[PDB]
Symmetry: C5
Subunit: 307 residues, 5 copies
């Protein structure tokens, strides 16, 4: 029941695809497993590069297809070598680049925590078993990830479990448990750019929205409101175009509704102030001095968005 040692060097993780829940991984994979000893030229181990490998299989060299359970489409394989040893053991080494899939919650958008994952498992073997898994990452955190998009927290999570697959296990009675290496890296989104360039501007916009109450007239107040309305729609548009498209509301996306909200609530007061009066036309004395009472009400409702 073959023992297989696996090592995965991760070179670069890039291009998140928020809608598809998808990321790209470039790196090498290495499998080691000891076979029947053989004679090599010299006694030095034998090297078999790329195209040559497939020919060695046509002569009965077994090389297991190791599948990336969670890759979306067969990955781009760059170079591959076999290292055949005189004492039997064999090393398969190949570089890959593949688009991998995992579940990703983006609802806390500018302040994400995500988990990038690889799942390796032999494509047709249940008593060939993944001996031990080792993943080599060569980075540093908190660090250069002001230049880089993501903040890794954890380093090394491994598994190597056994997967059941209870469907048509009578195709082969008593044996359908496959050996699955699971590799998972934890990361945090860098919430600088989105605060410094999206969160902040929007707040100023919502803030300046409230300054509508310090207009003297009523016509001034109500008309200016419509320009504030336009300003949010504009800023909603600006937000939407640049930010990652999703099927749920982000934090930013909520704040944008909060904008749409405060402004439309203003409209109501501004008008109800005019027509809650003792005569025909008296702006209600205290009410249009919600000047420093809208900011508080918004900020009060903006601390229950948090919990």
């Amino acid at each position: 029941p073959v023992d297989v040692s696996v090592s995965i060097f991760i070179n670069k993780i890039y291009g998140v695809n928020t809608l598809e829940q998808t990321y790209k991984v470039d790196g090498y994979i290495v499998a080691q497993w000891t076979g029947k000893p053989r004679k090599t030229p010299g006694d030095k181990p034998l090297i078999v590069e790329n195209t040559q490998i497939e020919r060695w299989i046509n002569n009965g060299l077994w090389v297991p297809a190791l599948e990336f359970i969670n890759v979306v489409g067969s990955p781009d394989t760059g170079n591959k070598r076999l290292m055949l040893f005189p004492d039997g053991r064999v090393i398969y080494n190949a570089r890959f680049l593949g688009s991998f899939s995992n579940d990703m919650d983006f609802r806390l958008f500018p302040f994400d925590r995500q988990q990038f994952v690889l799942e390796l498992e032999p494509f047709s073997y249940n008593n060939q078993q993944l001996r031990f898994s080792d993943i080599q990452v060569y980075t540093e955190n908190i660090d250069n990830e002001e230049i880089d998009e993501w903040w890794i927290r954890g380093k090394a999570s491994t598994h190597i479990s056994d997967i059941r697959y209870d469907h048509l296990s009578s195709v082969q009675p008593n044996q359908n448990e496959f050996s699955r290496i699971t590799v998972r890296i934890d990361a945090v989104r860098n919430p600088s750019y989105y605060l410094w360039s999206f969160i902040l501007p929007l707040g100023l916009i919502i803030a300046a929205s409230w300054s509508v109450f310090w207009l003297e007239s009523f016509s001034e107040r109500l008309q200016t409101s419509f320009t504030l309305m336009l300003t949010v729609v504009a800023y909603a548009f600006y937000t939407s175009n640049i930010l990652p498209r999703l099927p749920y509301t982000t934090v930013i996306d909520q704040m944008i509704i909060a904008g749409y909200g405060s402004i439309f609530a203003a409209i109501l007061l501004i008008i109800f102030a005019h027509h809650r009066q003792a005569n025909g036309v008296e702006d209600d004395l205290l009410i249009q001095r919600c000047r420093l009472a809208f900011p508080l009400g918004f900020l009060a409702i903006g601390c229950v968005l948090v919990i």
Copy 2:
């Protein structure tokens, strides 16, 4: 004849293409059919991975080409294996990723019901027949599909029918009926994001449009109208850019015309109010008090849009 058993494990459905009427499906396919018994090493069934399979065909191993009738372009095949059994039976197992086509009506956009479908059929065989079809999906609904885009309703629809193909059936008299497995999964779009972030803001915009009638002057009313106009045009643009492009009007797209409508009707009234008078310049008393009569008229017309 030949009886062929088929099993389809569905791993992921993603990336709908509204314009092309197209979706992406990643999963495995398994075919099983019993052939002439053979001698395998040991008596254990024989495994043939990838490249090696094509070599076994050059020696007369028949392996039927199974086509995805409704795939748009040949799909990306990841790994494939044969399981040759000593008692004859043979198992073909391969992972696929393909862009599939089906008829898709998107006119009720934020509230979709769709039917994602696979059609499998042998490419050159009419008395080789699909024994039984089984589809293995491992998800759950209503559930995580707040994080996920779609709500699956039904589970398992299968068919396995016979297709006629009456065109040049004299090429082979009396026999042109092909065995077609049909798999179809029903799903609903998650109308959360689009209401909370598109439907709602637009309504607030259309609502605030009506507040034009609570402006005192006429110059105020008519001028402000044009800013509302801009506001919709802006919001139409924002809508268009982010939402899926189509060749028909969505529900949202209608509401956007309702905006364009209410605003241009306002302009007419606002102007007709001014010059339907007893003197030269008397704004018609009751009419500019369609303040709470446009909302009713719009909401009345917005309850016949439903039926």
Copy 3:
């Protein structure tokens, strides 16, 4: 001088590319031609699927390369089979998906008439001749093409002509005429979506533009004009972003200039009204009552855009 029968099943026409003048076609092609009789296993015709076909050629099986003259780049071939008959005749069957090119005039944009075309011709043979061509489409019109983008008018146009190629016809004296099947289907664009959601809103915008003359002041008129100006620029952008990019002006594109025009003509009038006076400041009495004279002038010039 070989006779070749051809049949083309068209499965889907999708993804027009206005700029490249390009469309995608998925379907099957079938070629039939009678050769020297042979012994088949049994007397049943022999089936040769995909990879195996190329092996049969290495043994002297001639299979002519049929080129798609008007495909842009080698197409995606899905599955291919040979049907070798004991009485000699041979059937080549393969599914294709390819991006095809044809001349396409889009100047009458939302009201297009287009002609989608396939051109087949052997790549190196002049006395091998296309016997007869048959095209199988299974759709219906006027019908589902409210859900579908295009209205097919004609059904079936075929040709099968002879092409000259007078360039280096001394490379082979007296024989350079190639047999070319030409298939062309006529279709009309579905002018619903673009009217109900683009043409109409623009008209309402342009109409409301004229309501500038019903502003009492002159400052009101001239200032409001600039908001109308902005309104068009906004709507031009909205138009441009969503509509298919082209190297000529569409019908919609003309209407957008008419906006830019009337508004700038308004500016001129609005200002010329002010300073064509008997005193220093008398708005010219009749002129700013081009209220229901601009609409007429615009509509008159919009009936010579048609002829």
Copy 4:
């Protein structure tokens, strides 16, 4: 020292990539060169299609690799044939589609002159020499290029030169001259669409900008200015989004700055008019009658942009 005749049929030039300085070319290439006579079946020349060609090379048929020096990435080769003649001569014929590179100055954008270029050269041969080059283009100009994007001026420019490659010419002393066919077609951009739909609207915008001086007040002038400001930014965005992205300023891009300019110069005057006075508040009499002095000043500076 082999003489090679080449002919290049050009089918379509499309999809310019302004940023990458890149265009797509679909067409056929044919190479002819006389070799040692051979026996063909019959005495008719022998045809070798596609896959069969590579097999004929495995038996010592020499077919020179002809490289497209200026293709960006190996091109899509569709079909290839050999025509082996009994008297020796051999014809290589293949269809290609490739993305080609050349230097492209787009600074005079809507009024471009460009030169689309092919460079062919053997990949490993210096005394195999390109006998003569012939290029077959089948179009017409000035003509259909209102429907088409470009105006070809010249027809056929050819070269066929000798390239030195003085770097490691001691790898092979005295002989490093490669034979390079160079083909270049001159073309002009069709400056209709960009004038009728971009240049013109912007001028109207800039023109109407000057009508700010015909506003009576000062508050009217300065406030309206900011709306003009907004109008240009709007039009700049619309411009930028639709027009080809570049690393330099186009003509349009300059005109867009001219808008930004006149409007900000207006602001200065409008304000300087107010406070260059004899009392506290007297708008300077002659200056705000730069009404027909800004258009002149702009038009004067717009005649030195030309030379």
Copy 5:
């Protein structure tokens, strides 16, 4: 311990991908290494083109797989030849196009200094050693790079170092040092287009923002502010859409915050001017004459953004 000479011809560097930190490089690679002498036809060196090379490997011709350590995904290889010499030495020559990765700091965006790099290293060999590296670039700077995007500063940096790889060096005790050629060219972004068409317009916008203080009223000042607000949001959008997307703030991106700032600071002043009074309503005399005190304060804070 094989000595290998390498030469790298760089044909084109294009298509920077700011987000992925990635650029495209088209060029040729040449490897030379002296092997066991052999008999060639004639005594002229032997040429082996493309497909033929792989056949020569099946007969024991060793040709080392040279990997591009920093290429993202296996690169597009166009043409490859071997030049086998009678005296043993062998030349591998092939054209490549690949997307290469390197660390790229874009925080000083319109004024970048970047370093485009190739890292070559054998895929499975430690005592086969890269003798010397030579890179051939044929361009010129400062020059055509007004038409071109980038300014190369340095010419030629080479290395050829030894890499440790201390992980599973017991897989082969005492020998895990690989020979790595490193090539790096230094380049600067062309800060013309981004100043003349983005930086400049924005300054005029921020400048004209300050002219809000020269409005006579308070209602005039506060209302106009909101139009300025809209103006920036518009210009941020225009910027964001066209400029390269990043996960940090560019210089331009900061200037956009400065706009958002000055305008929101204006609003406070404008309002605090109104309500810092001796009576109920006296605009504070000196304060709304921060007319030429906001420009100084902004420029003062705009000289500490630099250091």
